[PDB]
Amino acid sequence: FMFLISWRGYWQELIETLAWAHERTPLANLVRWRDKPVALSIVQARLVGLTHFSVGYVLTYAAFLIASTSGKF
Amino acid sequence: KYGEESRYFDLKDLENTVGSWDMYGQEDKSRYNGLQSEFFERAANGLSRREYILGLVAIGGAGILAWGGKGAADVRLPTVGPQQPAQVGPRGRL
Amino acid sequence: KVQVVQPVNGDPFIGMLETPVTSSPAIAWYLSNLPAYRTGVSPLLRGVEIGLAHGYLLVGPFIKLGPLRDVENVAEIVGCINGAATVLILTLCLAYGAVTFQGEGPQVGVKTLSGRSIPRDPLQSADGWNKFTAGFAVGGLSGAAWGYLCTQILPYY
Amino acid sequence: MPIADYQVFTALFLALATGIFAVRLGVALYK
Amino acid sequence: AFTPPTLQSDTPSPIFGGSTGGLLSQAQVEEFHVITWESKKEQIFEMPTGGAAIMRQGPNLLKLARKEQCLALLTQLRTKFKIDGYIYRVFPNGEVQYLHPKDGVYPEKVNAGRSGDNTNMRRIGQNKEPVQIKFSGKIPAEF
Amino acid sequence: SHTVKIYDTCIGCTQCVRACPTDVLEMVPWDGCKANQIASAPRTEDCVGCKRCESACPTDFLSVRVYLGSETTRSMGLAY
Amino acid sequence: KKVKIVVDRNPVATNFEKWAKPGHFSRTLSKGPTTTTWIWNLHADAHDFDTQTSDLEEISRKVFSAHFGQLGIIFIWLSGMYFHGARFSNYEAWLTDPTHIKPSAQVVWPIVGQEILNADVGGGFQGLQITSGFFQLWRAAGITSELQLYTTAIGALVMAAAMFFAGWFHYHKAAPKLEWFQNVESMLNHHLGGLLGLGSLAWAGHQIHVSLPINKLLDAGVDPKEIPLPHEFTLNPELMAQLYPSFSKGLAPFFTLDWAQYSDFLTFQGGLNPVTGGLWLTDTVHHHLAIAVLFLIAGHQYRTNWGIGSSLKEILEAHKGPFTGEGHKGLYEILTTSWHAQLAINLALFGSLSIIVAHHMYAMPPYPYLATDYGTQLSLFTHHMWIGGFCIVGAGAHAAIFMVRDYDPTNNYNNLLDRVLRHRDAIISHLNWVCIFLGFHSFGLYIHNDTMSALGRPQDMFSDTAIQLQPVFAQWVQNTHFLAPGFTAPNALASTSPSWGGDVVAVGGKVAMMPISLGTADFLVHHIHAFTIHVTVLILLKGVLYARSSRLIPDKANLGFRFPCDGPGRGGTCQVSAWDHVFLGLFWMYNSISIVIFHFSWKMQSDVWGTVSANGVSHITGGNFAQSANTINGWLRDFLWAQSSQVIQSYGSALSAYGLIFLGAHFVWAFSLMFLFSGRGYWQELIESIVWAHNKLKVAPAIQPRALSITQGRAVGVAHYLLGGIATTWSFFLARILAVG
Amino acid sequence: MKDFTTYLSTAPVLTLLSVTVVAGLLIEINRFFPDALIAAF
Amino acid sequence: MSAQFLPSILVPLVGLVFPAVAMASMFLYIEKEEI
Numbered sequence A: 001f002m003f004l005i006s007w008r009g010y011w012q013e014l015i016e017t018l019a020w021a022h023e024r025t026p027l028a029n030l031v032r033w034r035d036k037p038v039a040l041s042i043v044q045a046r047l048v049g050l051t052h053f054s055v056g057y058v059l060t061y062a063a064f065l066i067a068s069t070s071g072k073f
Numbered sequence B: 001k002y003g004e005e006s007r008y009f010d011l012k013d014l015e016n017t018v019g020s021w022d023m024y025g026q027e028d029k030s031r032y033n034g035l036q037s038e039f040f041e042r043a044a045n046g047l048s049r050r051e052y053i054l055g056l057v058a059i060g061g062a063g064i065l066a067w068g069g070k071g072a073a074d075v076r077l078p079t080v081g082p083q084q085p086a087q088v089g090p091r092g093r094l
Numbered sequence C: 001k002v003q004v005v006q007p008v009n010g011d012p013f014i015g016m017l018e019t020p021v022t023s024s025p026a027i028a029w030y031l032s033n034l035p036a037y038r039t040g041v042s043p044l045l046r047g048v049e050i051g052l053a054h055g056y057l058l059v060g061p062f063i064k065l066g067p068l069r070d071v072e073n074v075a076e077i078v079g080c081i082n083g084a085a086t087v088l089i090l091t092l093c094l095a096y097g098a099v100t101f102q103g104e105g106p107q108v109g110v111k112t113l114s115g116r117s118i119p120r121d122p123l124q125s126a127d128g129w130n131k132f133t134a135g136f137a138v139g140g141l142s143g144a145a146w147g148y149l150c151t152q153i154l155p156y157y
Numbered sequence D: 001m002p003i004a005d006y007q008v009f010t011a012l013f014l015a016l017a018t019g020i021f022a023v024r025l026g027v028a029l030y031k
Numbered sequence E: 001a002f003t004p005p006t007l008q009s010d011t012p013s014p015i016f017g018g019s020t021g022g023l024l025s026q027a028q029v030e031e032f033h034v035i036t037w038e039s040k041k042e043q044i045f046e047m048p049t050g051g052a053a054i055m056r057q058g059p060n061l062l063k064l065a066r067k068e069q070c071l072a073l074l075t076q077l078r079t080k081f082k083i084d085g086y087i088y089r090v091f092p093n094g095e096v097q098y099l100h101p102k103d104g105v106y107p108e109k110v111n112a113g114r115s116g117d118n119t120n121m122r123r124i125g126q127n128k129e130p131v132q133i134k135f136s137g138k139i140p141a142e143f
Numbered sequence F: 001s002h003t004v005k006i007y008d009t010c011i012g013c014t015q016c017v018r019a020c021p022t023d024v025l026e027m028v029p030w031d032g033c034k035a036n037q038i039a040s041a042p043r044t045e046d047c048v049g050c051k052r053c054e055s056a057c058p059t060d061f062l063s064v065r066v067y068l069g070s071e072t073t074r075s076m077g078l079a080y
Numbered sequence G: 001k002k003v004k005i006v007v008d009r010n011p012v013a014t015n016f017e018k019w020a021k022p023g024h025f026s027r028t029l030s031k032g033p034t035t036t037t038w039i040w041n042l043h044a045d046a047h048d049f050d051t052q053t054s055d056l057e058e059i060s061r062k063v064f065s066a067h068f069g070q071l072g073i074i075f076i077w078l079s080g081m082y083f084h085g086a087r088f089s090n091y092e093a094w095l096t097d098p099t100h101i102k103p104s105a106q107v108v109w110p111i112v113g114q115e116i117l118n119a120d121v122g123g124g125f126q127g128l129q130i131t132s133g134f135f136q137l138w139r140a141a142g143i144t145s146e147l148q149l150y151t152t153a154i155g156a157l158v159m160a161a162a163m164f165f166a167g168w169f170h171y172h173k174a175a176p177k178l179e180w181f182q183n184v185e186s187m188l189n190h191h192l193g194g195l196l197g198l199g200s201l202a203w204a205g206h207q208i209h210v211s212l213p214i215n216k217l218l219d220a221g222v223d224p225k226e227i228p229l230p231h232e233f234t235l236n237p238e239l240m241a242q243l244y245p246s247f248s249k250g251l252a253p254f255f256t257l258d259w260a261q262y263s264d265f266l267t268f269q270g271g272l273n274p275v276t277g278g279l280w281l282t283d284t285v286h287h288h289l290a291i292a293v294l295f296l297i298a299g300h301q302y303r304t305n306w307g308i309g310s311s312l313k314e315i316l317e318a319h320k321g322p323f324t325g326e327g328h329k330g331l332y333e334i335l336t337t338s339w340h341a342q343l344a345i346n347l348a349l350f351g352s353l354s355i356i357v358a359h360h361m362y363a364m365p366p367y368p369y370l371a372t373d374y375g376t377q378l379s380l381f382t383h384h385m386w387i388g389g390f391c392i393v394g395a396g397a398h399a400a401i402f403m404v405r406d407y408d409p410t411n412n413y414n415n416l417l418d419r420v421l422r423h424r425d426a427i428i429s430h431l432n433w434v435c436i437f438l439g440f441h442s443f444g445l446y447i448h449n450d451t452m453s454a455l456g457r458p459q460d461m462f463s464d465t466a467i468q469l470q471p472v473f474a475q476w477v478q479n480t481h482f483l484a485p486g487f488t489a490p491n492a493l494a495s496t497s498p499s500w501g502g503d504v505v506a507v508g509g510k511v512a513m514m515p516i517s518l519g520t521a522d523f524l525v526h527h528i529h530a531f532t533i534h535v536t537v538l539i540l541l542k543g544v545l546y547a548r549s550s551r552l553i554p555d556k557a558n559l560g561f562r563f564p565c566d567g568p569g570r571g572g573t574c575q576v577s578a579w580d581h582v583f584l585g586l587f588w589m590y591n592s593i594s595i596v597i598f599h600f601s602w603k604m605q606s607d608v609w610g611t612v613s614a615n616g617v618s619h620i621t622g623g624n625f626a627q628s629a630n631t632i633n634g635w636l637r638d639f640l641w642a643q644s645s646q647v648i649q650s651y652g653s654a655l656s657a658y659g660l661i662f663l664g665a666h667f668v669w670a671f672s673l674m675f676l677f678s679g680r681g682y683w684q685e686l687i688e689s690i691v692w693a694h695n696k697l698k699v700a701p702a703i704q705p706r707a708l709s710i711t712q713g714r715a716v717g718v719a720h721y722l723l724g725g726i727a728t729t730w731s732f733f734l735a736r737i738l739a740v741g
Numbered sequence H: 001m002k003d004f005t006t007y008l009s010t011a012p013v014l015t016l017l018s019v020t021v022v023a024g025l026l027i028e029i030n031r032f033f034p035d036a037l038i039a040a041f
Numbered sequence I: 001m002s003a004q005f006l007p008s009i010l011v012p013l014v015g016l017v018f019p020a021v022a023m024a025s026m027f028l029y030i031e032k033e034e035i
């Protein structure tokens, strides 16, 4: 639901702000990212939210079904 | 920079104008005292190469597996201890 | 009348601001005097000191809070845990130095806050970070070992 | 009658062999 | 013919108190843009990085992380102040590339002497079907 | 590195050029429309992909078509 | 200069010609609804007076008349509540037996089997059990009569007519000029003294002459029929001297400053009245008199038509320090010329006030027999919590709107607004780090507890019986409050609330208020509250600070406060506007307030509310909070599954309406998920197919059907989400607390 | 009253009055003919 | 269950050793620059 509701723009600004933080935090400027941190793309985060939705759906129902049948029979 | 007034750009001095600074890094030879520096460079001599510092991680993972082989049971841990009866279940099962 | 928040080095177009914590003389002296900002001394001894500090750091949480915190032999098992933690942080340094120092990039350079040119630090190099990783190796396991020995020789524990 | 130690070890060795086959197939697919 | 103006490095900057949205680590190792404009009086404008700055009489020099920030500042100068300006692309090795008013006049006005590339002589619906360009590394619209 | 294309339905109203925030589009002389001007995209490397030009095109269907493609440090609009 | 009344004679004609044409207020809505987007924008921009006219005078007049109309609506609502208390309520019966008779002020018409909702509340009456607490408030005011409630309803209807007449008069006959609205000195001088101070003094007068004698007789125990009417208690000091002997000497000790003789009815004990479980009404009288004097003193601070007083601009501009540059330079001008900034400040402090009201009213009930009715207590707390959170989110929204529209960088150079805008990255990054740290050290503690319980290691989880996390500061603050009387509160005979410590206050066999102990679970849930509040602050503050501009989008102020995006470029700029920050902060406020009210209900059903049996206190759930509220499975099972049995088995009873709403709100919440997860292009293309189907049968509307806009879709989704979640919690809370207690 | 009746003819007023009269008609139908499960003639 | 020691070795191998080596290897390979 997190990726489903919120969209790419709040996260990009937040990541830019955190990149500003790390690029000029003392004792951490020794290391730097090889790949520039960016927000997930719109299609990518739609896919990620869908994947989490399906995984949570399946895990929740499998847990409930197996518990409510095996614990009872 | 040439920032004697309000001029913060200079192509002949483009190093300072871009913003590349040390912030806190300062150059100084004096820090660590004698004999101990040689002691520590001898302690970390041949290990500086990437392959041997990889081999240190290899023997670390060997220790990880040695815990599972003989080390988990030495600190007891319930996963290798004994068991106490059992439970039947909802109906006539086991 | 008194000015305490200023642009850094004059130009108001850089991301920092002069602030009485990011550039107060005591804190600036303390940050410059940390080993990680000693570009003059060899990176191996710097990594040794960093590893010693961090290895002696990591003992405590595992001692007081680990799964075997309530049994007498917590110190040895925590020394083992800290050895494993030092190894994994060591391979983190290995991977970082191998991926970010596979080539060269001599661009622009670096100067001080006053206007004097300074070398661009031997730590930021393939061979330099190898010495730092090797220093963190012997230092990290020694700090854990000294943390184990501190559990038996300290009076107040 | 549960299987023996030698059967488990032989199975694990054959799994190592088929792992070599698997990485050969993967390398061929990457090329 | 038209010649691009040189980037006069020793140009005064607007009065500003220092922001956090200014230059970062991209300026040192990739690129940072810069905008130059002529102001007829001392007056307050708005920075693209946040906050208010006072540009001074005469030449004003401001470096920005991205070209979009430079064009935002230029368009607000052109609308709220009727002030034109020049934007330059400055590489860290030293080379400076002229940017926005490339041929003197603004891009929304014709100049007769530009390059009319990326102008297809067909309609939207006259592109090729994707099956006819299959396994090519190109979209249907760049044929 | 975004593909921006101009098509002959362009009427030369210059609105796509005015809508561009990174100066990608410009007007070149043309003879296919009443205004005797058509849009062109010589600086697509500065294109971020915002599609503000498409939002300003009054032609149905629009004449300045932006195809999002390869992403660079300028197409992603990064200041870091 | 010179505060005075200035108005314009007959600015706007009164007729119905603009009622015929919708969308007249804005130019963009002219030339008819070509699409249904016009229909949606007509309601979207009805109150956006900035987009209707550019004149601050007309905006101010519209705001003033809208305030009058809102006051008329509130007066109609109050008249309806008093009329329902008069006609369709068991208020007189409840007055005789407030301990056992359940309050009710609404009955239903037997039409479709819905007469089952008329509960057997008691007193020979059938109706819906109300949880609003009007009965306790009326008993506190000393009504004890049906005719007086009807008279108050008629008076409130008259006041509503007066409000509507005032709004029409001040928009159409005598509309005040702009400089009348800008007399903030006079407005504060009259709101401090003439509104709040005089209102508190008048309520103290009513409480002295009406509430004290009638409620004193009720507490001593007398049927309300034979109690003397309020006027004859007010008419002569004889009966008052029988009840409060200090009235025999009248106003003489007041003017001679021998005020200590008024100590029988101007008291200061603290605690609760043991007969009713509410606060002592003499203490409330003393409180209202003291704050009335304080507010009337506060009403002379500012300078108007005479030389005495201090100007707000002068006080602001002189509060400048070395760390902040010019300080409060420009704040007077951006608050006397921008309505949205004042709306943001007032909404923030108003929501904080509502939350403080919720806190102070559960902690120590002010009305008689309010503590014993757990239903109205839980409902009042939860309602004020939700109103406070909503108003706070609106404060963030209007701060963002001011930043977009009414913020001028010319008159805001190097001031506090400029200083904050010039280092927004630091503030936002640091709030982000605080949010991450709080999220870890709050939620991961719960997850660790879940994992250790599920691994069979109860000694390793954070709990009172294992690894303790004790709120030592909060416990010591409770101890300081409990030890306050006789030490740091020498004139207090009891502590402010029994929650600090002491004996259990029991009224009618039920606990009014008992001490609350804080343990590990309370520590965890308070840190959860801090984390949720911090994330909501992060979203709202980020929207306000980056409303003007950004690294990604440098010209966000040009695109406006409410725009969907700036295209798929720069990786994607979806929800970059400050409006979408409000849209996300709405969900986060929902989450925060939901956790707060869950903690409230579980904590007081487990450790406060219950019955007394002369050997202990039997709580509603039985002390299960201390051993189950540190585990998410405990919240799901022992609170969210155990207490849900009352609302799902409510069919065939009076709580069947709560049972039905419990499912309908689930439906609405999941209906929100359509608008929140999907996008406009799909619905537009589907609408195109439906338009083809309509064209095939010549039934195409001339007003073109369009899919909801992106901002429209987000607004609909968040509205449905919050409505469904809040109504689910409301039905659950009310059914659970009215079935058991 | 032409403008007032035009306001009464506006879409929200007309739809609210129409759903009001339809709901009232259905309610009085159920008041006089309650519990009509089927169309038994 | 025959050879009870074997899970005690294999589970840390595929939970710590093999995953750490695989993650380090893939992190090295994704930024190899010149493969």
Ligand code: CLA
Pocket: G012, G013, G014, G015, G016, G017, G018, G019, G025, G061, G062, G063, G065, G066, G068, G069, G070, G073, G164, G165, G166, G167, G168, G171
């Ligand atoms: C019957 C008397 C009357 C008449 C004939 C008018 C006529 C007019 N007024 Mg006016 N007004 C009146 C009374 C009246 N007003 C009162 C009592 C107030 C105080 C609230 C106002 C305050 C006011 C303001 C501030 C403004 C006008 C404006 C206008 C002009 C156009 C707007 C309009 O009416 O569109 C039609 C309006 C409606 C059909 C009604 C609006 C919706 C109502 C107020 C909702 C009330 C709440 C209601 C219970 C719904 C709540 C939710 C519900 C579903 C449960 C118009 C000529 C505007 C103007 O002059 O334009 C510049 C202007 O801005 N009026």
Ligand code: CLA
Pocket: G063, G064, G067, G068, G071, G180, G181, G183, G184, G186, G187, G190, G191, G193, G194, G195
């Ligand atoms: C002692 C003088 C006094 C009093 C009692 C009030 C009271 C009030 N003002 Mg007001 N105001 C005053 C002076 C006063 N004002 C002056 C001098 C100015 C010019 C600077 C203003 C400018 C002003 C503005 C711009 C606004 C208010 C508003 C309000 C209302 C606040 C909202 C609310 O719901 O409160 C609680 C509600 C009640 C207490 C209900 C009681 C209502 C009665 C009728 C109050 C009668 C007081 C009135 C001033 C008497 C003179 C009017 C007379 C001809 C009938 C409130 C009733 C706001 C409002 O809501 O608009 C209506 C608002 O917009 N005031």
Ligand code: CLA
Pocket: G043, G044, G045, G046, G047, G048, G049, G343, G347, G390, G391, G392, G393, G394, G395, G397, G401, G561, G562, G579, G582, G583, G586, G719
């Ligand atoms: C003192 C309170 C107050 C006031 C005076 C305003 C005033 C204003 N707000 Mg605002 N706001 C507030 C509180 C307030 N707000 C709160 C508490 C929130 C948090 C939710 C917001 C969040 C907010 C946003 C996000 C926006 C505004 C906007 C606006 C402006 C235009 C409003 C408009 O016409 O849109 C239309 C108003 C409506 C269509 C009314 C219906 C709104 C919903 C659907 C009603 C909720 C349903 C209700 C609970 C009934 C449910 C039962 C149902 C089953 C029947 C206006 C000046 C808009 C703006 O652009 O600012 C310039 C903007 O987009 N506000």
Ligand code: CLA
Pocket: G667, G668, G670, G671, G672, G673, G674, G675, G677, G678, G686
């Ligand atoms: C409880 C959640 C929920 C509900 C009720 C729906 C309902 C619907 N979806 Mg949907 N969907 C959901 C979740 C949900 N979805 C989610 C999470 C997703 C993933 C994003 C989707 C994605 C999706 C897609 C992609 C599509 C739909 C479509 C539809 C419609 C199918 C037609 C139909 O079955 O008629 C049933 C009608 C209803 C269920 C509405 C309820 C009846 C109302 C309440 C009666 C009105 C009474 C009253 C006046 C209500 C107003 C009260 C107010 C005035 C106070 C339907 C309205 C398809 C569509 O549009 O069909 C053409 C479509 O293509 N859905």
Ligand code: CLA
Pocket: D008, D011, D012, D013, D015, I006, I007, I008, I009, I010, I011, I012, I013, I014
């Ligand atoms: C894909 C099938 C599969 C799966 C899902 C599992 C899963 C599991 N095995 Mg098992 N195993 C398998 C095949 C499989 N095995 C086969 C065919 C053999 C015969 C040689 C064994 C022999 C074996 C032994 C002796 C033991 C386990 C054990 C275990 C458990 C811990 C893993 C471990 O430590 O052992 C490591 C597993 C191996 C060394 C061999 C597995 C090789 C499989 C076929 C790889 C398949 C990968 C798949 C096709 C693609 C995924 C991508 C991947 C390559 C990254 C775990 C639940 C331990 C246990 O009992 O736990 C209590 C244990 O000691 N397995």
Ligand SMILES: CC1=C(C/C=C(\C)CCC[C@H](C)CCC[C@H](C)CCCC(C)C)C(=O)c2ccccc2C1=O
Pocket: A002, A003, A004, A006, A007, A008, A009, A011, A012, A038, A039, A040, A041, A042, A045, A046
């Ligand atoms: C949080 C968030 C982000 C921020 C992106 C984040 C935080 C990604 C960072 C995740 C880190 C890397 C941890 C992820 C852990 C995963 C389980 C690891 C998976 C890796 C695979 C190779 C297996 C967006 O960019 C975004 C964009 C559009 C809509 C919604 C969102 C959104 O919700």
Ligand SMILES: CC1=C(C/C=C(\C)CCC[C@H](C)CCC[C@H](C)CCCC(C)C)C(=O)c2ccccc2C1=O
Pocket: G674, G675, G676, G678, G679, G680, G683, G684, G706, G707, G708, G709, G710, G712, G713, G714
């Ligand atoms: C369903 C859906 C639509 C389609 C929605 C439409 C076409 C609106 C339907 C409204 C109809 C026409 C009116 C129905 C009236 C009801 C009987 C009561 C509605 C409540 C009103 C009184 C306010 C979108 O347009 C959309 C856009 C962006 C993101 C998500 C979505 C989305 O999920």
Ligand code: SF4
Pocket: F006, F009, F010, F011, F012, F013, F014, F015, F016, F017, F038, F039, F053, F056, F057, F058, F059, F062, F063, F064
């Ligand atoms: S907006 Fe469209 S029609 Fe106008 S010049 Fe640009 S491409 Fe041509």
Ligand code: SF4
Pocket: A007, A042, G564, G565, G566, G567, G568, G569, G572, G573, G574, G575, G679, G710
């Ligand atoms: S997906 Fe929608 S909100 Fe996001 S960039 Fe595209 S049009 Fe804008």
